[PDB]
Design goal:
The structure is cut from a larger assembly and holds chains A and B. Chain A is an alpha+beta fold. Chain A has one domain: Alpha Horseshoe (Serine Threonine Protein Phosphatase 5, Tetratricopeptide repeat). In chain A, about 55% of the residues lie in helices and about 10% in strands. Chain A is built from 15 helices and six strands. In chain A, the strands form two sheets. Chain A has a three-stranded antiparallel sheet with strand order 1-2-3, with no helix packed on it. In chain A, helix 1 runs antiparallel to helix 2 and helix 12 runs antiparallel to helix 13. By secondary structure, chain B is mainly alpha-helical. Chain B has one domain: Serine Threonine Protein Phosphatase 5, Tetratricopeptide repeat (Alpha Horseshoe). Chain B is built from ten helices and no strands. The longest helix of chain B has 14 residues. Classes of the chains: A alpha+beta, B mainly alpha. At the A-B interface, helix 8, helix 9, helix 11, helix 13 and helix 15 of A face helix 3, helix 5, helix 7 and helix 9 of B.
């Protein structure tokens, strides 16, 4: 059922169920000689009659024949037990993935990376997590967070994005679930990362006015700190300290004249 | 008497030094420079003149900065119009930003909806006890309704400060001097 063949381009391929797979390629015109079930390998030869042999897995070829025929269970229970080495297992695994059979591919694959990836595809979130330690790849934890959030598993998404240090996604979660300590922690994190906008919004939704104010001040945005302060009733003493700093900054920048025209909490209409 | 000073760029420089914002805007409108507008806005903010910063923001189409100014300024009203602009402009990041400032979690859930994130639309409606629409989301998403692993604890959005003042503060109080 599987047609093995040589190409005009010097490649050794095989065709099955409408699919074409590459086995190898040579730098000389090869001509197929035949397959020896005994040695488990194909034999070719060039024009000068030099014989070459390539090892193929009759099991792998048969597993594929069945799968593409709609008889994968048959392939899994009859052919799979005779598959040797993980190199062959990995082949079947990647062939199965390339066939949408993520579930079964997850079971066959010996490659941990592929496993994790496959688990996300089929929603086996727990399995996936219990497959990543301090496994560097913050990019994997994010992939895990996205996967979880896709399947409404917020609790896991939250854990993934946190370890992934993906502050944008984590913010969407903590802000939606009004987690004041999460927000405040994320902001400080955002500040360390220069994510000044994110930080302000995190502090804001958390209701951490004091945090938001100091953020603005550390950025020399004193007038804005003053507006925020008086608009959200921080208190005159509070507001006046911001004004004092606003004025000191002005003087440090040589704008002494403007510095002296700035009123304190007093001038603010009906405190 | 800056009218007579020779170079428009120089006029702008002097206006800023003398703190003359009226003259600075005249040179700004004409010189119509991106860098110039940015220096002017910076000068307005140094004097607490939010009105001018707003002015320059509108004409220079920096809506998110407009929204932030309405926030610290207590302009609750104008803050919604920024929603209608961020909407009729296809910018989910913005229509969402205004809800962080408006604390309108009902709009936010809806935004996450068309936004293409039912899970979040749900998360918002849920924590904010809007049980009604939360299910409509779950339904609409073909989600089990029982595999939805919420976090151990939630809370509605009540930690957000509110305007203590009545009227927005358009300019910060300055002496005649």
């Amino acid at each position: 059922d599987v047609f093995i063949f040589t190409t005009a381009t010097n490649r050794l391929n095989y065709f099955v169920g409408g699919k074409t797979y590459n086995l190898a390629h040579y730098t000389k015109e090869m001509y197929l000689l035949g397959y020896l079930a005994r040695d488990n390998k194909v034999y070719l030869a060039d024009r000068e009659v030099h014989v070459y042999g390539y090892e193929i897995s009759l099991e792998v070829l048969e597993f594929q024949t069945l799968t593409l025929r709609g008889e994968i269970e048959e392939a899994i229970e009859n052919v799979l037990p005779n598959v040797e080495g993980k190199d062959s297992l990995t082949k079947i695994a990647r062939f199965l993935e390339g066939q949408e059979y993520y579930e079964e591919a997850l079971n066959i694959s010996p490659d941990q990376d592929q496993k994790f990836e496959l688990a996300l595809k089929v929603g086996q979130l727990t399995l996936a997590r219990d497959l990543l330690t301090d496994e560097s790849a913050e990019m994997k934890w994010r992939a895990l967070g996205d996967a979880s959030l896709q399947r409404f598993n917020f609790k896991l998404a939250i854990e993934a994005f946190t370890n992934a240090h993906d502050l944008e996604s984590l913010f969407l979660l903590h802000s939606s679930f009004n987690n004041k300590e999460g927000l405040v922690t994320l902001a400080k994190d955002a500040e360390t990362t220069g994510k000044f906008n994110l930080a302000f919004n995190a502090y804001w939704i958390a209701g951490d006015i004091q945090g938001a104010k100091d953020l603005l001040i550390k950025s020399q945005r004193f007038s804005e700190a003053a507006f925020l302060g008086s608009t959200y009733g921080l208190g005159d003493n509070e507001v006046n300290d911001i004004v004092t700093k606003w004025k000191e900054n002005l003087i440090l920048n040589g704008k002494n004249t403007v510095s002296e025209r700035v009123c304190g909490a007093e001038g603010l209409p009906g405190s | 008497a800056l009218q007579f000073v020779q170079d428009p760029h120089i006029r702008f420089d002097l206006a800023l030094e003398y703190g003359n914002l009226d003259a600075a805007l005249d040179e700004a409108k004409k010189l119509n420079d991106s860098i110039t507008w940015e220096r002017l806005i910076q000068e307005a903010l140094a004097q607490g003149n939010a009105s001018l910063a707003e002015m320059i923001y509108q004409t220079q189409h920096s809506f998110d900065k407009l929204s932030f100014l309405y926030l610290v300024t207590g302009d609750v009203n104008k803050l919604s119009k920024m929603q209608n602009i961020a909407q009729t402009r296809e910018d989910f990041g913005s229509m969402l930003l205004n809800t962080f400032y408006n604390n309108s979690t009902k709009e936010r859930s809806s935004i996450f909806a068309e936004g293409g994130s039912l899970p979040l639309a749900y998360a918002v409606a849920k924590a904010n006890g809007d049980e009604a629409a939360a299910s409509a989301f779950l339904e609409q998403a073909e989600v089990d309704e029982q595999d939805v692993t919420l976090p151990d604890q939630m809370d509605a959005s009540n930690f957000v400060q509110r305007p203590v003042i009545s009227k927005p503060l358009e300019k910060w109080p300055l002496k005649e001097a």
